[PDB]
Write an enzyme that holds these catalytic residues in place. Structure first.
Site, PDB file in Angstrom:
ATOM      1  N   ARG A  81      41.367  36.476  37.531  1.00 11.85           N
ATOM      2  CA  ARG A  81      41.191  37.817  38.044  1.00 11.85           C
ATOM      3  C   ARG A  81      40.534  37.711  39.407  1.00 11.85           C
ATOM      4  NH1 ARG A  81      36.731  41.991  36.745  1.00 11.85           N
ATOM      5  NH2 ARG A  81      37.398  43.646  38.165  1.00 11.85           N
ATOM      6  N   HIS A 125      37.383  46.505  45.039  1.00  9.92           N
ATOM      7  CA  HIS A 125      36.154  46.005  44.450  1.00  9.92           C
ATOM      8  C   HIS A 125      35.016  46.232  45.440  1.00  9.92           C
ATOM      9  CE1 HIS A 125      34.576  43.085  41.250  1.00  9.92           C
ATOM     10  NE2 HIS A 125      33.526  43.410  41.978  1.00  9.92           N
ATOM     11  N   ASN A 170      37.491  48.633  40.354  1.00 10.85           N
ATOM     12  CA  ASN A 170      36.448  47.955  39.602  1.00 10.85           C
ATOM     13  C   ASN A 170      35.206  48.837  39.564  1.00 10.85           C
ATOM     14  OD1 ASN A 170      35.132  45.263  38.510  1.00 10.85           O
ATOM     15  ND2 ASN A 170      33.768  46.024  40.111  1.00 10.85           N
ATOM     16  N   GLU A 171      34.956  49.423  38.396  1.00  7.97           N
ATOM     17  CA  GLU A 171      33.713  50.118  38.087  1.00  7.97           C
ATOM     18  C   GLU A 171      33.391  51.309  38.990  1.00  7.97           C
ATOM     19  OE1 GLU A 171      30.860  46.919  38.235  1.00  7.97           O
ATOM     20  OE2 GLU A 171      31.119  46.431  36.126  1.00  7.97           O
ATOM     21  N   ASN A 308      34.057  45.662  31.653  1.00  7.33           N
ATOM     22  CA  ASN A 308      32.992  44.754  32.066  1.00  7.33           C
ATOM     23  C   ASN A 308      31.782  44.969  31.146  1.00  7.33           C
ATOM     24  OD1 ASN A 308      34.776  44.059  34.122  1.00  7.33           O
ATOM     25  ND2 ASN A 308      33.494  44.908  35.772  1.00  7.33           N
ATOM     26  N   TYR A 310      28.185  43.425  29.665  1.00  7.64           N
ATOM     27  CA  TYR A 310      27.089  42.485  29.915  1.00  7.64           C
ATOM     28  C   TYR A 310      25.898  42.599  28.957  1.00  7.64           C
ATOM     29  CZ  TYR A 310      29.134  40.940  34.348  1.00  7.64           C
ATOM     30  OH  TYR A 310      29.920  40.409  35.318  1.00  7.64           O
ATOM     31  N   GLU A 381      35.025  41.258  32.612  1.00  9.26           N
ATOM     32  CA  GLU A 381      33.859  40.461  33.033  1.00  9.26           C
ATOM     33  C   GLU A 381      32.856  40.327  31.906  1.00  9.26           C
ATOM     34  OE1 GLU A 381      31.670  41.894  36.453  1.00  9.26           O
ATOM     35  OE2 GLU A 381      33.504  42.421  37.560  1.00  9.26           O
ATOM     36  N   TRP A 428      32.777  36.167  34.186  1.00  9.46           N
ATOM     37  CA  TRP A 428      32.182  36.355  35.501  1.00  9.46           C
ATOM     38  C   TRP A 428      31.062  35.294  35.632  1.00  9.46           C
ATOM     39  CZ3 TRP A 428      33.451  38.995  39.833  1.00  9.46           C
ATOM     40  CH2 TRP A 428      32.547  38.851  40.901  1.00  9.46           C
ATOM     41  N   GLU A 435      25.987  37.784  45.478  1.00  9.35           N
ATOM     42  CA  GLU A 435      25.679  38.754  44.429  1.00  9.35           C
ATOM     43  C   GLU A 435      25.064  40.035  45.002  1.00  9.35           C
ATOM     44  OE1 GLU A 435      26.684  39.186  41.495  1.00  9.35           O
ATOM     45  OE2 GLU A 435      25.268  40.733  40.855  1.00  9.35           O
ATOM     46  N   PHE A 444      25.781  33.320  39.097  1.00  7.58           N
ATOM     47  CA  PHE A 444      26.605  33.718  37.937  1.00  7.58           C
ATOM     48  C   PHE A 444      27.732  32.723  37.566  1.00  7.58           C
ATOM     49  CE2 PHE A 444      24.863  38.086  38.246  1.00  7.58           C
ATOM     50  CZ  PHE A 444      24.852  38.451  36.912  1.00  7.58           C
TER      51      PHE A 444
HETATM   52  O1  LIG Z   1      26.102  41.522  38.560  1.00  8.73           O
HETATM   53  C1  LIG Z   1      27.171  40.606  38.289  1.00  8.73           C
HETATM   54  C2  LIG Z   1      28.557  41.225  38.494  1.00  8.73           C
HETATM   55  C3  LIG Z   1      28.929  41.504  39.959  1.00  8.73           C
HETATM   56  O2  LIG Z   1      28.798  40.324  40.747  1.00  8.73           O
HETATM   57  C4  LIG Z   1      30.362  42.053  39.990  1.00  8.73           C
HETATM   58  O3  LIG Z   1      30.857  42.235  41.316  1.00  8.73           O
HETATM   59  C5  LIG Z   1      30.447  43.414  39.299  1.00  8.73           C
HETATM   60  O4  LIG Z   1      31.826  43.646  38.962  1.00  8.73           O
HETATM   61  C6  LIG Z   1      29.538  43.470  38.115  1.00  8.73           C
HETATM   62  N1  LIG Z   1      29.402  44.480  37.245  1.00  8.73           N
HETATM   63  C7  LIG Z   1      28.457  44.164  36.334  1.00  8.73           C
HETATM   64  C8  LIG Z   1      28.010  42.905  36.667  1.00  8.73           C
HETATM   65  N2  LIG Z   1      28.683  42.506  37.761  1.00  8.73           N
END
Ligand SMILES: OC[C@@H]1[C@@H](O)[C@H](O)[C@@H](O)c2[nH]cc[n+]21
Ligand SMILES: [Zn+2]
Length: 471
Positions: A81, A125, A170-171, A308, A310, A381, A428, A435, A444
Site C-alpha cells: 500500500r 494522504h 486516508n483518514e 487503520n 492502532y 494500517e 504500518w 512521522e 514505526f
Molecule cells: O502515527 C502512525 C501512522 C502515520 O504515520 C500514518 O501516516 C497515518 O495514516 C496514521 N494513522 C494512525 C497512525 N498513523
C-alpha cells in the site's frame, strides 16, 4: 514465537502487505517537477515539526524503490500500500501534468508487478497541493469534488490498466480533527487560531466534502473505467476502539456515542446513506444535509472499507446536556479514561496516544461486522513505534513490536474465525519514516532506516513476518 500463526491460520488468499505514504517516504519533495503540498509549507516553518525536520529527503524511496520492493518480496508479502502525491502529478493541483512524476509511479507500479507484489494505491494522504489551498480554500470548498474527480480520472486513465486496488482518501476524520478542530496539522485552523477558523463548524464541512469527493470520484470510475479495467475503489478510515468503563447505561451510551462520532461519521453515509442519528440530534444544523441524490451517490460507493486500527480507550458517560457549541471533540459529550480497576488499558509505545491494546483489534472488527452488515474490510494500517536516539542494534532487536503483531494478529484471527469479512492486513510501516509532527523521532518501521546513511536493515519483526508468511 509465531504463536501458531501462518498463512494456513488465515483464509485462503488473504492479502498480507506493508504500507507507506508519499510524503513520509519518497523524498524529492522539491525535485522531479513536484509542486509543494500544504505539508511542505507547514514542515518548512520553524517550530512546526520536531527538530525543524521535513520530508525533503525522507527515506529517498524515489531513488531506491527497487531496493525496497526486493526487500518486501524477500519478506514474503503479497501487496504494498502506497500513495500517489497529487502535487507530483499536477504541481498546481490542476492543469499541467508533470510527466517526470507520471514516469516515477509507472516505474514503481511496473517493478512491483514484475516482482509479483500487488499495488494498493491511495490517491490522497494528507498532501493537498498548496496551490489548491491558496486558490480554493482546500476542503472547505465544495469545488474539491470536481478538482479531486479530475485528478482521480487522470490516475484511473494513466495507471488503471495495471492498478486494480484503489483508495481515495486516508483518514478524513484526522484531516478534519487536526486541521480544523484542534488546528495542529495544516491548514492549522480552529476557533483560537492565527490562520482563522471555527472548531464547531469547519470539521463537519470538511468531512462532508471528503464524502462528496469520494462519491464523485467513484461514480467517475464506475461510469467510465470499471467496465474495461475491472478494479475496485475504497476508502481508508481510522477506527480506535472505545470500551465502556462500566456496564451502566451512562457508560455504555458514551462508548457508543464515541463510536458513532469516530467511525459512524463516515460509515453510516457510506453504508446506509445518512449521518448517524446521534450526530443529527447533537450537532443539528452545524451538520450538513445530503440531498437524496447525494446520499444515493455516497451510499454503496466503497467496494471495501480500509480500517487503520492502532489502539483503544475506556469511555465514561454523563447526562446529555444542552450546551453552547464549541468543537467537534466537545460535541461527543464523553470523558476519556485510560485505566480500569487500578490497571492501565495497556502500556504505551513511543507515541503518547498509542496504547498497546490487542483486544481493540477484535473490538473494532467485530463491531463493524455486527453493525454494518459485515462489509468487506481491509486492515490498511496497524503498527507501533520505538523512540529516537537508540543504537542500530537496539532498533533491530524490536521484541516489543514482535509481541505487538503476534497479539494483534491473533485477535484479528479470532474475529475472522467468527465470520468477519476481512480480506487483508497491512503493517504500518515497511520503513522508519517521516512521522509528521514527530519528524524522525518516532520509528514505526519493520525495517530500520539509518537517517544519516539511508541504509535499510530489517528488524526482528521483519524476520517474524518472513517466517509467518512463507509459502
Ligand atoms: O502515527 C502512525 C501512522 C502515520 O504515520 C500514518 O501516516 C497515518 O495514516 C496514521 N494513522 C494512525 C497512525 N498513523
Ligand atoms: Zn537520492
Amino acid at each position: 514465537w509465531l504463536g501458531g500463526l501462518s498463512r494456513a491460520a488465515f483464509p485462503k488468499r488473504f492479502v498480507f502487505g506493508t504500507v507507506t505514504s508519499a510524503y513520509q517516504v519518497e523524498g524529492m519533495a522539491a525535485s522531479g517537477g513536484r509542486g509543494p503540498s500544504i505539508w511542505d509549507a507547514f514542515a518548512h516553518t520553524p517550530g512546526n515539526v520536531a527538530g525543524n525536520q521535513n520530508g525533503d529527503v525522507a527515506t529517498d524511496q524515489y531513488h531506491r524503490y527497487k531496493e525496497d520492493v526486493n526487500l518486501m518480496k524477500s519478506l514474503n508479502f503479497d501487496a504494498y500500500r502506497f500513495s500517489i502525491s497529487w502535487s507530483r502529478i499536477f504541481p498546481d493541483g490542476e492543469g499541467r501534468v508533470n510527466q517526470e512524476g507520471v514516469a516515477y509511479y509507472n516505474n514503481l507500479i511496473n517493478y512491483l508487478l514484475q516482482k509479483g507484489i500487488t499495488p494498493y494505491v491511495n490517491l490522497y494522504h494528507y498532501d493537498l497541493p498548496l496551490a489548491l489551498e491558496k486558490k480554493y480554500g482546500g476542503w472547505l470548498n465544495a469545488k474539491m469534488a470536481d478538482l479531486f474527480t479530475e485528478y482521480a480520472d487522470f490516475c484511473f486513465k494513466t495507471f488503471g490498466n495495471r492498478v486494480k486496488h484503489w483508495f481515495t482518501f486516508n483518514e478524513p476524520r484526522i484531516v478534519a480533527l487536526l486541521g480544523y478542530d484542534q488546528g495542529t496539522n495544516p491548514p492549522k485552523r480552529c476557533t483560537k487560531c492565527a490562520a482563522g477558523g471555527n472548531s464547531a463548524t469547519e470539521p463537519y464541512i470538511v468531512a462532508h466534502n471528503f464524502l462528496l469527493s469520494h462519491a464523485a470520484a467513484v461514480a467517475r470510475y464506475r461510469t467510465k473505467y470499471q467496465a474495461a479495467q475491472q478494479g475496485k475503489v475504497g476508502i481508508v478510515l481510522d477506527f480506535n476502539w472505545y470500551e465502556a468503563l462500566s456496564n451502566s447505561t451512562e457508560d455504555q451510551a458514551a462508548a457508543q456515542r464515541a463510536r458513532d462520532f469516530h467511525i459512524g461519521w463516515y460509515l453510516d453515509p457510506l453504508i446506509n446513506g445518512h449521518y448517524p442519528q446521534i450526530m443529527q440530534d447533537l450537532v443539528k444544523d452545524r451538520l450538513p444535509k445530503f440531498t437524496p441524490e447525494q446520499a444515493r451517490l455516497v451510499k454503496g460507493s466503497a467496494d471495501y472499507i480500509g480500517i487503520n486500527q492502532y489502539t483503544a480507550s475506556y469511555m465514561k458517560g454523563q447526562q446529555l446536556m444542552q450546551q453552547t457549541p464549541t468543537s467537534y471533540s466537545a460535541d461527543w459529550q464523553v470523558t476519556y479514561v485510560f485505566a480500569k480497576n487500578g490497571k492501565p488499558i495497556g502500556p504505551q509505545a513511543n507515541s503518547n496516544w498509542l496504547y498497546i491494546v490487542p483486544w481493540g483489534m477484535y473490538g473494532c472488527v467485530n463491531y463493524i461486522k455486527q453493525k454494518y452488515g459485515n462489509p468487506t474490510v481491509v486492515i490498511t494500517e496497524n503498527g507501533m513505534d520505538q523512540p529516537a536516539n537508540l543504537s542500530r542494534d537496539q532498533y533491530l532487536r524490536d521484541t516489543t513490536r514482535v509481541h505487538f503483531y503476534r497479539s494483534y494478529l491473533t485477535q484479528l484471527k479470532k474475529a475472522i474465525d467468527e465470520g468477519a469479512n476481512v480480506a487483508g492486513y497491512f503493517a504500518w510501516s515497511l520503513l522508519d519514516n517521516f512521522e509528521w509532527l514527530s519528524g524522525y523521532t518516532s520509528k514505526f518501521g519493520i525495517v530500520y532506516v539509518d537517517f544519516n546513511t539511508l541504509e535499510r536493515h530489517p528488524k526482528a519483526s521483519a524476520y517474524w513476518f518472513r517466517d509467518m508468511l512463507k509459502h
